[PDB]
Amino acid sequence: NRSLIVTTLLEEPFVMFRKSDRTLYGNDRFEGYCIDLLKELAHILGFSYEIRLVEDGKYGAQDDKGQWNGMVKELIDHKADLAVAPLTI
């Protein structure tokens, strides 16, 4: 039942800006493919989420210490629960 904290980065058309004439709050800032996937997945497993921004604007990028940034280090330090955007395996 629990809001799996989403960090995000905007990519086209995976996670776009939502452009509407409604006033958009947070999650409503973002439209796109993985948003529709996330709604599907919440309808599957019956819990919830909360979309936030990325910590620096990056997809992510390791250094030579193993030091990531972006959404990658957002899920390394476990300071999001989900990361709705295209992230490579």
Side-chain angles (χ1 to χ4, degrees):
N1 43 19
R2 183 164 41 75
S3 91
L4 300 188
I5 299 305
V6 179
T7 186
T8 213
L9 173 56
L10 296 97
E11 279 299 329
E12 177 161 56
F14 291 102
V15 173
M16 323 161 67
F17 264 123
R18 182 172 280 123
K19 293 72 63 181
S20 291
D21 60 348
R22 205 204 81 169
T23 176
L24 301 178
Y25 317 99
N27 321 318
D28 311 305
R29 298 158 71 208
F30 305 121
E31 63 182 54
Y33 168 91
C34 316
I35 313 303
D36 295 16
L37 171 67
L38 166 68
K39 286 180 303 189
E40 288 180 321
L41 289 171
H43 293 168
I44 300 171
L45 296 173
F47 44 54
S48 60
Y49 46 88
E50 172 53 50
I51 319 182
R52 313 186 184 291
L53 288 180
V54 54
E55 71 196 53
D56 58 12
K58 289 179 179 286
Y59 306 101
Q62 209 181 253
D63 307 332
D64 58 351
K65 289 67 58 171
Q67 176 56 223
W68 294 86
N69 43 25
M71 306 189 308
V72 187
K73 173 69 51 176
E74 270 285 323
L75 298 182
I76 284 169
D77 299 356
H78 312 274
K79 58 197 178 174
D81 286 350
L82 297 176
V84 171
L87 183 62
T88 194
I89 298 180

